[PDB]
Design an enzyme around this catalytic site. Structure first.
Site, mmCIF file in Angstrom:
data_model
loop_
_atom_site.group_PDB
_atom_site.id
_atom_site.type_symbol
_atom_site.label_atom_id
_atom_site.label_comp_id
_atom_site.label_asym_id
_atom_site.label_seq_id
_atom_site.Cartn_x
_atom_site.Cartn_y
_atom_site.Cartn_z
ATOM 1 N N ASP A 32 51.758 60.946 34.670
ATOM 2 C CA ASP A 32 50.387 61.003 35.421
ATOM 3 C C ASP A 32 50.299 60.109 36.476
ATOM 4 O OD1 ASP A 32 47.754 61.587 35.621
ATOM 5 O OD2 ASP A 32 46.920 60.364 33.738
ATOM 6 N N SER A 63 37.428 48.562 29.613
ATOM 7 C CA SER A 63 37.493 48.667 28.208
ATOM 8 C C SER A 63 38.790 48.245 27.550
ATOM 9 C CB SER A 63 37.219 50.297 27.519
ATOM 10 N N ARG A 102 40.519 42.546 31.158
ATOM 11 C CA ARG A 102 40.157 42.008 32.438
ATOM 12 C C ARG A 102 41.441 41.950 33.257
ATOM 13 N NH1 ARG A 102 36.673 36.289 33.207
ATOM 14 N NH2 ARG A 102 38.295 35.932 31.721
ATOM 15 N N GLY A 130 39.231 43.141 38.585
ATOM 16 C CA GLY A 130 38.476 44.321 37.942
ATOM 17 C C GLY A 130 38.225 43.964 36.584
#
Ligand SMILES: CNC(=O)c1c(C)[nH]c(/C=C2\C(=O)Nc3ccc(Cl)cc32)c1C
Length: 253
Positions: free
Chosen positions: A126, A16, A19, A13
């Site tokens: 989170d 921002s 990679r 993937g």
């Protein structure tokens, strides 16, 4: 230590941050990944945070938490465990796409294995589906919270965080409930067109039962984690004592 020790296999993937690549280690043919991060554009003030974060990731070795292996400076490479099955958000997306609810057995594995990831996290002191990963062997792994940091919109926003209360471990139980709910329903328990509208839904505390293919007992536990009062939610220990949770739902490596 050095990028010449790793053979780049392919890009998994991009973002921002940089990679994500699948890599084979030259040592013993070990398949891993790295996050490829360009620090050349950043200031030292952000570099002071990033360095403090890479070393903090070295702490937790746990079967249900994505494992750190190595760091390389060339670009910065953070070498992690490879999770063949990808993330949970894609599983949900695929479920929606194929019009197919996930097996209760898979939901019980996620519940068992993430609760154990949380037990460990809380010991150190989170949960989004995008930050939960699957290996090729039915195992579930929580992404390092410190890794996700360096790399109605929220939905999983506990009543405590909302009512401006300080964070507690029961807030993580709330987020776990939202994840398990979404995994069952293929939608979050609360949804709205605005964030203040979302807040109204959450605080009212009402949601649809998970699909009827899921047992009353699974529904009961998810519902309990979605209580408005943090003290009505089950603890990690209470979750794992649940008769639903069996040996085969745990990790196997
Ligand atoms: C569609 N996604 C994939 O196929 C996928 C695969 C095969 N692996 C991953 C992600 C990771 C992976 O394989 N190892 C990881 C370690 C840390 C983090 Cl934050 C992510 C990963 C992904 C998103």
């Amino acid at each position: 230590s050095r990028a010449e020790d790793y053979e780049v296999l392919y890009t998994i993937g991009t973002g921002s941050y940089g990679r994500c690549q699948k890599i084979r280690r030259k040592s013993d043919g070990k398949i891993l990944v790295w996050k490829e991060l360009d620090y050349g554009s950043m200031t030292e003030a952000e570099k002071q945070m990033l360095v403090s974060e890479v070393n903090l990731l070295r702490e937790l070795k746990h079967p249900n938490i994505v494992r750190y292996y190595d760091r390389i400076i060339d670009t910065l490479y953070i070498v992690m465990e490879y999770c063949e099955g990808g993330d949970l958000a894609s599983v949900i997306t695929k479920g929606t796409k194929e019009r197919q609810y996930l097996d209760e057995e898979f939901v019980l594995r996620v519940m068992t294995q993430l609760t154990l990831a949380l037990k460990e996290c809380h010991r150190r002191s989170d949960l989004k589906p995008a930050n939960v990963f699957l290996d090729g062997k039915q195992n579930v792994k929580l992404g390092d919270f410190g890794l996700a940091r360096i790399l109605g919109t929220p939905y999983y926003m506990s009543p405590e965080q909302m009512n401006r209360m300080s964070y507690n471990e029961k807030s993580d139980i709330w987020s776990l409930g939202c994840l398990l709910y979404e995994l069952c329903a293929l939608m979050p328990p609360f949804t709205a067109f605005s964030q203040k509208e979302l807040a109204g839904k959450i605080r009212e505390g009402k949601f649809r039962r998970i699909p009827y293919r899921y047992s009353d007992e699974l529904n009961e536990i998810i519902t309990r984690m979605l209580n408005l009062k943090d003290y009505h939610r089950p603890s990690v220990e209470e979750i794992l004592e649940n008769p639903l949770i069996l040996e085969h739902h745990h990790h196997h490596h």
